[PDB]
Ligand binder design. Sequence first.
Ligand SMILES: O=C(c1csnn1)N1CCOCC1
Length: 291
Amino acid sequence: DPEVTLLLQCPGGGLPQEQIQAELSPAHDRRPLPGGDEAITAIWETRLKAQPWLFDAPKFRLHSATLAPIGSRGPQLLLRLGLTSYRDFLGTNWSSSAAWLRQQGATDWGDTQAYLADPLGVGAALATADDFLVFLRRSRQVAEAPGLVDVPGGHPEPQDLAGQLVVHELFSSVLQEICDEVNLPLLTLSQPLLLGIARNETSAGRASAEFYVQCSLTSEQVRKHYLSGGPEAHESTGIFFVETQNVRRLPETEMWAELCPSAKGAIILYNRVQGSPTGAALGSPALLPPL
Ligand SMILES: O=C(c1csnn1)N1CCOCC1
């Protein structure tokens, strides 16, 4: 799977909100482009003169994420974040020249990402009461990953002493994206656990935080809520469910070639962090069948 790389695998089965610190600093921003940010402004002007209803939005930028020594007390993860925008994404990661910008960043800064917007995504491994994960089908008419399978998620918009409010917005945003697209009541969802961070090498290395969320509704009840919104209540074109039993071997299935990179990252981290038991009971052959 060359189109996804793991940047972070969380310990303890995943981290709760209270164990994460954020540092939001202009030191974590994209570097100005070598020949100037006028190249971004030109791409944006061309796009608005074809689609004048488009609008810019702020985004968080991922610089890096440092895990504490395993088994330690106190905060377990430090997220170093800057600020970026949808406009800067279109002019860098989404540009035909994105690979040239990665090479220039290695040369100038020793950092393949230094010239890339790198907006932070969120995604969820969303489990039902009857032990299935939730999958969504993308429209065949959108620009990114048309017709592919995704999981619930999105790219959160901004608004440890500004830090804790940023971590709160990240955790809040993955629940809001589940309520907006799957049409589930907020009170049927668990507090999220962070499983890790995955990079999309098809989008010049932009990263997504991948979370585990449990729902108190069955697969049948989740399906009814999604469909009862009607076609205008969701961007996806369909919902479907895979038993958690079967997610273990998903990379060996024909479904794997249909998954978009950020959804592949969610399922790899689910299998490594929530699956893959370490104890004698769940690791016994009848409960963890060999192969
Ligand atoms: O929020 C984002 C986004 C992706 S990368 N940074 N921003 N979207 C949603 C709307 O359609 C375009 C992509």
